[PDB]
Symmetry: C3
Amino acid sequence: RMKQIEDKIEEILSKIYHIENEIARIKKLPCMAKFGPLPSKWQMAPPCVNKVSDWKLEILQNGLYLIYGQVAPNAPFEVRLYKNKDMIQTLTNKSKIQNVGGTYELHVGDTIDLIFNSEHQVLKNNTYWGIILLANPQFI
Amino acid sequence: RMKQIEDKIEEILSKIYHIENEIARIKKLPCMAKFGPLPSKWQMAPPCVNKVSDWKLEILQNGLYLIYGQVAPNAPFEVRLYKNKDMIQTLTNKSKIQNVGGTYELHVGDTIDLIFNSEHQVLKNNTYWGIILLANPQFI
Amino acid sequence: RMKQIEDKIEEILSKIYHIENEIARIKKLPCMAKFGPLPSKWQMAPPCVNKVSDWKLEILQNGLYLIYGQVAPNAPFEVRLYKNKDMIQTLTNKSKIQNVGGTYELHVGDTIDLIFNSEHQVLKNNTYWGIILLANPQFI
């Protein structure tokens, strides 16, 4: 009868250890990435995105993303944000620092790219763009 | 004295079971909805919103929402997003695919509607809009 | 041998109490602030922001923020949103209610201010702006 009690106590300790493991994991528990400003390249925080090349990223998780950034201006001025082949934003103003992005549903395999007409039209040390995953509902 | 120990062990098991219940619930624990592209109608992920009619939704929780979507163009072109009776955005460009929405504080009872000037001006299979609840602070 | 069992049971109870404390804290666990519409002044929900003056706020945590609001129009019309000294948005339209803000990376010490050309150009009872912290990755 002592042995039973002692065997239950051993089982209880083990469950408590398991629980503290679950709690540790809960305490630890969004996906984001940013390119630039140079000299910084891709910075990230399963991944929802994969860097492709400078200024260009690939989406690895279906979902609702917010894209953000700024282009600092330094041949007509033109900076374009692309989703795959579709131009999704064009920046045209050479005087002011301009915001880039918006909220987009994106699917596995999509790419996002920020392309400069002339590389030297832009102050690469105050120009950057990033992305954050807001949600991944089943319907996307 | 054995009985006490055994009764405490029974009480402990029950508390552990309760704890694992609380953990299960924590592990399980945003509100979102999307209309379209057709043939899809309302898709959702207490609810913060209630569908009203096609393209139209009602808010059931006070809060800060982000509205998103795109209108794919196919009589002057005009698509309008409404909050109640107030037009909150107008889309006028027949060439490019255009984003819809922005961040809005919304209150219980508000409605959001996307209204097309001509139904057939739009490619309904690449046009959709959705909403996500970002936060519900007391001040809204 | 009884004493050992009893001492283990005491230790177990204490661990369970600790666990329920951790769970309580987990259950309790975004930073936001809103100014206006008047007569309301600053409303908030370590803080990520500190009010400075009416319509003006200081950032105390590095991070990615979404700024939102609306200006309800009532000398050429001009309302400007500032980040430090940089104008980041200008509102110029005296007919429609206009959205303010966008997504911005902000650093400790930055200020955000909404400045009216003429105070009485605006309906202060339907004009307000607010901010929400989306994320604080190491790279900001």
